């Protein structure tokens, strides 16, 4: 978001959400 | 009168506050007291023998840096009582502490007399009109916008896992461990001493954590990554002196998984988060791994995310969902949290106000604390 | 005499390893005397 | 031959061992297997990586403690193997386990299979020529010279009541729960870290439960003394550090009588026996509150009698005559007990002999277990 | 092996070198390399730019001198080989490097490419059949003859304390810093600029270390004895020359026990030694507190007894028994402990041989030293 942007402590280039494989 | 509330996070890392309404916190500094170690022989040299904020982090290398609170509990109070005067001060926000009222984040399952003094403060120290202590992990759903989570909150001085469920949280499957990222720097600084690079002055231990943020990852397998030759990335100090850090970078942050290895008898982050889970009813066991909320700067490692999944994976029951969400704004969310619940017309109900404390006392806080 | 009463005493050097590695838990050298 | 019989009292804190027509238990240790967290450097140092009973006292902070048997359920079956190893080792009893004949004591309502590989052992490693496996209250009745009388044996691992009649034990009226000494030594902890004293290590966790034991009171009226402000007595650790106990004292013990705190909905103790007894007949019900044995460790909490007395009055019905009765030996009756049974010529047929055991298998053990 | 190890203390200020077996080091000499800065202009003059040990001490005013090892660290290598070299020759122990194995005794938590090149010398440039290197504590213990004490080592170029308990050894409570007997020789130099005694060259300086041993106490109270008028004791120089040393006798010493004399952010040799046993176990600190023992040549300063003792009692906890144990040969403990190990056959086991490390490399150093 360009609001939160401005901070200097903000994550980019990364996944917003760790999750398992559905399929076994 | 109701002015705006002032949202204070106490972090052991960097202080962060503002007013309620606001996005972002506009004001963030580091939570020490820097007092100057040399001789003043001019006359016409920097005054003061306190130095808070970006004046101590311009001229550090004068200053002598302690930090008042260790593990989230206030050790020195006359220095924390000071750091609160600088919030309302014309440096930071530069506003009556009579107006406005406070909204403090404090960590869960802290002594009571810790709650009691710091109280005492902002009712007899500062004549503030109300006062309300709100947990950690309950600001962050708000933050997050979410009534059902786990909110894994790894700080610099803490580390806790709380499960809260529909707006519901349950006391007995709280669980806290001293080591946080603080313990990591002080791991790291070991191996830069059998490198060879010694860093005995306080100024220096903050250059080693600035280390530890520019080049350091976490390995998804330790034993390869220990059998494969590592790159020596290069870090470039302040007077131009390059350190190679090599193998040290992946090798400290596997404290946050492994505590044997500074050697304290606890359990790892990874049986933290799980074991909450485990604590819990049967009925919503399998809707915790499902909402997982990451929180805290120790979050921050490259492949935090994909080691503690598979940590987790292990340890959590065969074929179970395991969704881990984490916000860009890991940092700033407590705070965002804060703002939120102070802005609701119902925080009028959940403060205690200064008449309030001053007729029943300690009491009302303690009531209210969880 | 400091001689005399370590003279008898023996370590366990089987696997032994003190080095900074992670594989494999804790380590602890010097087995036992047997 | 017929040699002497050994008797075993399996118990969870403490393991009492010694011959049959013995007054006393000669070998008394603890329930726990210590191994050594440090590193071994010089020669000459303490050998070997296993440390059990009064070698685990003495050198308690190099050793990390885990105990094989919780809630009378043995998790780790090859460490209390080694500890039964120990019990005819050269330091305890002093002869061989083919000899002589073994009694155990196991707790009421165990698992099958738990008792069933018990047995194995000792007819398959151990080549015993016969073992009889005894209930805790049956031996209670022999060891204060009453066949009829309710036994509350509160021990450090379970709780339970078992009412037996001129002889005769009603299986359905036997009544345990999982809340015991261990339990509230846990609790307690908790306490301690809110006034602010950490005791993370298991070394650490033994000192806890000697605080416990050493200072620690029931309150009669628990509302009074939680109003009412402590006078926060004062404990010596073995370093020399003093620490304030003050209100965690009587706040810890209440668990057993209000499972709410730790947040299990299972009965109270109190309740455990008035509704162990309200199972019963009518024309029996008024003899077994006239006729209440009081045993385990988890009763020798000062004032334990007193609110035990005053919480059956409440739940029982008026205008009965309430008579607890508490042996002096209360944790040396379960052992006195199996020194008395066995003892006994009749003993010789109780028992299940090598022969029969490899004959019928587990069947046979299963059979006269009761 | 049939030939004797050769035992090798390398110290900073005294390389004491000898066999196994032997009763004291038969060869003491300086850890320096002298090169003649006047020209040589005669025939028949010193042959040689070259002087170690006698001739160094017999000749020092043509020389200048240089330490090829500072806090323990090997500064220039070439000039540390030259040595190693000189303790094989015909003027020190004069037999074949090849022959013998070597038992080297360095500092605790020294830099892992010291140690790696320092190896690399014994196996490359020596043809050693076996290396093993120890720790300077462990050996301390050996001659003392006692498997648990703390041994504060204080050296000329090193001060660290080790807690060791029945052979055991925590690496994690062990402490180290750089100020040791050599940094007071130069904080002497100071007072004597400041009284007006120039002592500028190399040779001057081994003067102003001597005037050191000779004339310096340690006060029980340093702001009173500061205060009060002190007595100018007079020392004669060499060429015949009377020098009054003064207040400087006490005023330079102080420096181990406040480094903010200096300005280094650090601990005191008394705070070093209470910390370390804190660190330690709270069952273990009692004994730790009992079993004092003092090594190192910087311990030798008269009242570092009455000092250390009044100091450890102020931060030591209250009804503790606190027993400084002294070895009359405090300056040889060291090398006799070395001496004591290498003569046990459990020490063959120990070795690494040349064939190993050809195949292994460093990682075979790292793996088997501690
Ligand atoms: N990019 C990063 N990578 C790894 N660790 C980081 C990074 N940024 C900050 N940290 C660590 O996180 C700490 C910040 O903790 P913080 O979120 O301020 O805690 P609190 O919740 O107590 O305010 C820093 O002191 C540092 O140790
Ligand atoms: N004086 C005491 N006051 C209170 N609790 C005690 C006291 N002595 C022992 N206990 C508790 O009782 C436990 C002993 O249980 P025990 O009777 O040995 O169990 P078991 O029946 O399994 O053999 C101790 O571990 C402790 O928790
Ligand atoms: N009598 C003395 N009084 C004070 N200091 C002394 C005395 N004798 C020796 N020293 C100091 O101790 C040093 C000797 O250190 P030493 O113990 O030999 O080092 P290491 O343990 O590193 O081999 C000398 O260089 C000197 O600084």
């Not at chain 2, 890392?13 to 001019?42: L, S, T």
């Not at chain 2, 100090?237 to 390059?242: A, V």
């Not at chain 2, 990451?294 to 969704?323: C, N, W």
């Amino acid at each position: 978001d360009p609001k939160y942007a401005d901070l200097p402590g903000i994550a980019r280039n990364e996944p917003d959400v760790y999750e398992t494989s559905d399929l076994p | 009168i109701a002015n705006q509330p002032v949202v204070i996070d106490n972090g052991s890392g960097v202080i962060k506050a503002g007013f309620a309404g606001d996005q972002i916190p506009k004001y963030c500094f580091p939570n020490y007291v820097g007092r100057p170690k040399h001789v003043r022989v001019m006359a016409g040299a920097l005054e003061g023998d306190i130095f808070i904020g970006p004046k101590a982090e311009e001229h550090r290398g004068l200053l002598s840096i302690r930090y008042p609170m260790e593990h989230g509990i206030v050790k020195d109070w006359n220095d924390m009582e000071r750091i609160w005067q600088y919030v309302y001060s014309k440096d930071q926000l530069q506003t009556f502490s009579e107006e406005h009222p406070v909204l403090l984040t404090e960590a869960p399952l802290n002594p009571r007399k810790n709650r009691e003094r710091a109280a005492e403060v902002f009712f007899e120290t500062f004549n503030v009109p109300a006062l309300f202590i709100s947990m950690q992990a309950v600001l962050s759903l708000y933050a997050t916008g979410r009534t059902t989570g786990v909110v894994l909150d790894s700080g610099d001085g803490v580390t806790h896992a709380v499960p809260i469920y529909e707006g519901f949280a349950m006391p007995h499957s709280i669980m806290r461990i001293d080591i946080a990222g603080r313990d990591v720097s002080r791991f790291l600084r070991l191996y830069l001493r059998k490198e060879g690079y010694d860093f005995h002055s306080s100024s220096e231990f903050e250059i080693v954590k600035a280390i530890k943020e520019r080049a350091c990852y976490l390995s998804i397998n330790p034993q390869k990554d220990e059998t494969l030759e590592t790159e020596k990335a290069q870090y470039y100090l302040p007077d131009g002196s390059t350190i190679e850090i090599g193998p040290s970078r992946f090798r400290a942050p596997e404290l946050l998984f492994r505590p044997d290895l500074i050697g304290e008898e606890s359990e790892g982050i990874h049986e933290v988060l799980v074991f909450a889970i485990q604590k819990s009813d049967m009925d919503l066991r399998r809707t915790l791994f499902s909402n997982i909320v990451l929180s805290g700067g120790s979050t921050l490692f490259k492949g935090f995310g994909d080691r503690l999944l598979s940590e987790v994976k292990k340890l959590a029951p065969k074929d179970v969902k395991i969704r881990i969400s984490a916000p860009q704004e890991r940092l700033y969310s407590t705070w965002i949290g804060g703002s939120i619940l102070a802005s609701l017309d119902t925080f009028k109900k959940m403060w205690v106000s200064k008449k309030e404390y001053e007729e029943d006392g300690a009491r009302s806080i303690h009531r209210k604390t969880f | 005499a400091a001689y005399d009463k370590f003279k008898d005493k023996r370590v366990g050097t089987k696997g032994l390893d003190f080095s900074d590695r992670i594989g494999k838990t804790k380590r602890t050298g010097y087995e036992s005397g047997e």
